[PDB]
Homo-oligomer: A and B are copies of this chain.
């Protein structure tokens, strides 16, 4: 067998042009190929413009239309995602001009607000700046946007390490079993900063014990045309008393009705794999602290 690695690690220098160029061209091809017989001259013009941009700047920038296409195709290319059957139902937030952790925080608040939608969950992805030389990475250190702290264990067991990490960074822990972890945000390669999520932004389902309604993956990397975006949180909705509690509180889960309706909406939008979502190495294992 020759499976590929599902992890894409850090770099300490820009991607070499001889490597980036062919990848960029292959992506531009799959983008314009999605127009069948249309836009041959547009395809060539874009090829020419990207090549000169790479040769002059060392990299290139996607158009927002190309970015939206990439995020949806990477979702389609996700092997284990049940949700990928309706891949066209995705809202993209473009945060590629983001510069600070405080700005990252506001983008994430926007995402949580929109996606939670008072329970009527919507799928969304927020895309922060692509990797340049790999020393200025944007990253979310969280594994999910919303998750409970873990501390005889109290809270979520799978967060024990991250919870201690937040505490080390100055986060003041309560010791409940449903404490929502803070956001730990790294911008432009700097040391992470800690941001409490405003409680009103966290919708929870009461089991009739409780659980948060928004499942959002915070820690993966989007690869597209040789470009890498190491910060790109996305969310879908969840797939017992839980089955009853979510429906009774009007929070979306993937029951048969939702499966049918979301596929129907997808279907109306018609009126090595790449692009791809990669796992990364946990950033606290690779980060060089500056202070």
Please list the residues of chain A having a beta carbon within 8 angstroms of any beta carbon in chain B: 1-7, 9, 11-12, 45, 64, 91, 102, 105-106, 109-110, 113-114, 117-118, 152, 160-161, 193-196, 198, 201, 279, 281, 285-286
Q: Is B118 in contact with A7, judged by CB distance below 8 angstroms?
A: no
A283 to chain B, nearest CB (A): 12
Q: Determine the distance from Cα of A196 to Cα of B5 in the docked complex, in whole angstroms.
A: 11
Q: Determine the distance from Cα of A77 to Cα of B152 in the docked complex, in whole angstroms.
A: 30
Q: Determine the distance from Cα of A161 to Cα of B93 in the docked complex, in whole angstroms.
A: 12
Q: Is B7 in contact with A106, judged by CB distance below 8 angstroms?
A: yes
Q: Is A1 in contact with B194, judged by CB distance below 8 angstroms?
A: yes
Most buried by B among A5, A45, A64, A194: A5
Partner of A91, one of B4, B7, B106, B285: B285
Other A-B contacts than A2-B196, A5-B106, A5-B110, 4 sampled, CB-CB below 8 A, are A1-B195, A7-B110, A9-B113, A11-B118
Q: Determine the distance from Cα of A102 to Cα of B279 in the docked complex, in whole angstroms.
A: 15
Q: Determine the distance from Cα of A117 to Cα of B286 in the docked complex, in whole angstroms.
A: 9
Contacts of A6 on B, CB cut-off 8 Å?
Answer: 106, 109
Q: Determine the distance from Cα of A114 to Cα of B198 in the docked complex, in whole angstroms.
A: 35
Whether A1 contacts B196 in the complex (CB less than 8 A), given A91-B285, A281-B114, comes out as yes
Partner of A45, one of B114, B152, B285: B152
Q: Is A12 in contact with B285, judged by CB distance below 8 angstroms?
A: no
Partner of A113, one of B4, B5, B91, B106: B5
Enumerate 28 A-B pairs (CB-CB under 8 Å) in ascending A order. A1-B195, A1-B196, A2-B195, A2-B198, A4-B198, A5-B106, A5-B109, A5-B110, A5-B113, A5-B198, A5-B201, A7-B106, A7-B109, A7-B110, A9-B113, A9-B114, A11-B118, A12-B118, A45-B152, A64-B160, A64-B161, A91-B285, A110-B279, A110-B281, A113-B281, A114-B281, A114-B285, A114-B286
Contacts of A9 on B, CB cut-off 8 Å?
Answer: 113-114
Contacts of A117 on B, CB cut-off 8 Å?
Answer: 286
A76 to chain B, nearest CB (A): 21
A159 to chain B, nearest CB (A): 12
Contacts of A113 on B, CB cut-off 8 Å?
Answer: 5, 7, 9, 281
Contacts of A152 on B, CB cut-off 8 Å?
Answer: 45
Q: Determine the distance from Cα of A198 to Cα of B1 in the docked complex, in whole angstroms.
A: 11
Contacts of A286 on B, CB cut-off 8 Å?
Answer: 114, 117
A289 to chain B, nearest CB (A): 12
Closest B residue, CB atoms, query A109: B5
A202 to chain B, nearest CB (A): 12
